[PDB]
Amino acid sequence: GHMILLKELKELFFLRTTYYLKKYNRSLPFGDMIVDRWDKAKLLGFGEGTSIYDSSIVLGEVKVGKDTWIGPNTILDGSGGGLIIGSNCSISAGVQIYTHDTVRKSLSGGKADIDKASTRIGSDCYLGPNTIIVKGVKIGDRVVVGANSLVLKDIPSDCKVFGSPAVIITDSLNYQ
Amino acid sequence: GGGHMILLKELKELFFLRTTYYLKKYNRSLPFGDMIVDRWDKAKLLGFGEGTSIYDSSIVLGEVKVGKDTWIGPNTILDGSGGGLIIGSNCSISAGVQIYTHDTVRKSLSGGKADIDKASTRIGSDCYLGPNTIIVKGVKIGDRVVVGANSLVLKDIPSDCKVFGSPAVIITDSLNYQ
């Protein structure tokens, strides 16, 4: 009856895929056709209108505002002092936001502690695909962070940044 | 009674048995979803061409056409929601590759007031997109193109080119690879 569960799961996958294509014009991972993104967000205590894919990892204390879109394959790590994210943010596919790292733990052969620092992002921000935000970063409001960036330092409001490591390119007023 | 306890136990047993089978038959260990979902059958169900495969972990939005013998890797995004995405035959769409026809920059930056911006995207045949390549909306990639890993492609790429970088630049031709 593990053969039975497997067959029932393959059937359900087929049926959910068919449903999703016909009704929502998309095909998702199996996990994402069980989990509703808005119900998941609500269960995690996020603000109304916020949505989060099944494939996201949310660690520790994470607060998120209203109407924020948390994409697939994301990491929201508030384990090292908490992570706060505002309203109307785009947290694109693959974005990873941290409040700790294990560099010293590893390099020390297992001896050093994990290093921790809180991180914060304002409202009306766009974090592009595969952006990495390290511990301790404060991102102000209305910020654009381009795809593939690595943010190592605070970003003031109304800035657009880009690069690994990210640098301020211009202001974001043209997008507003 | 105790229904979800029984379901959890059977899921754990199934995971152990599927992992065992995949190790023995296919010398790999995959996410649980990828040991339920068959990559070729999934491609079939999405109407992709013969020989095409796609992992469970992929997201396919809107109108996406894919040719024959194309490999769509894990953790990928094939977003055809903003006027369609077309991909040719014999392409490597590596793990982590994200291909877009829309973005939500202005929508966010305007505090939720601006529309989503959209533009169709197209990729030819015999192309390699390396791990974690990001292709933005409006981009047209010709045939026989190499995009190196970690690239961000902001503009059209002619056939027979090799590109690299964030943003990506043409560094040479791809003839060495053909």
Place this chain on the structure above:
Amino acid sequence: GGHMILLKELKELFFLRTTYYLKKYNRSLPFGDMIVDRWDKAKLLGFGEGTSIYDSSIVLGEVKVGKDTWIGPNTILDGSGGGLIIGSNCSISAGVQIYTHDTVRKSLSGGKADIDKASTRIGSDCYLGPNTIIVKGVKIGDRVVVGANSLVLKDIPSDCKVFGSPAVIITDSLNYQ
């Protein structure tokens, strides 16, 4: 019918397991990672004691991992092209992809060329930051820092810190030890 009942039970189990992880483990994980235990998975794959690996990781072919190594989510450990060896006390961050093959020629030749392969090795006490990509044939010594978003195309000696796409030696890693 029977599939609608399975769906409802899966939704219930998702809610229950999420509550469990939030309240006991202070986290919310993908559904797949709330079925598979990371240490038991690592044990099933033959990895050293103390090692863990997320459900979302793909492990291909022959792969050896030492003790107390953390293999993150959304990772690729590809030992299909002559094997991959990883030491002990390593952090293999989220998104890291480690290869021993590629399919560039196969695609660019229209499906005619063979897959190219080369073994890869990483020492002990190493850190690979988020989204690092390691290509085939690479050897990384002990006590190396690879910064986030790096692409590693060549061997890295012990006690180095590297960064970039492609990655270059920036300094030594002694300060982290």
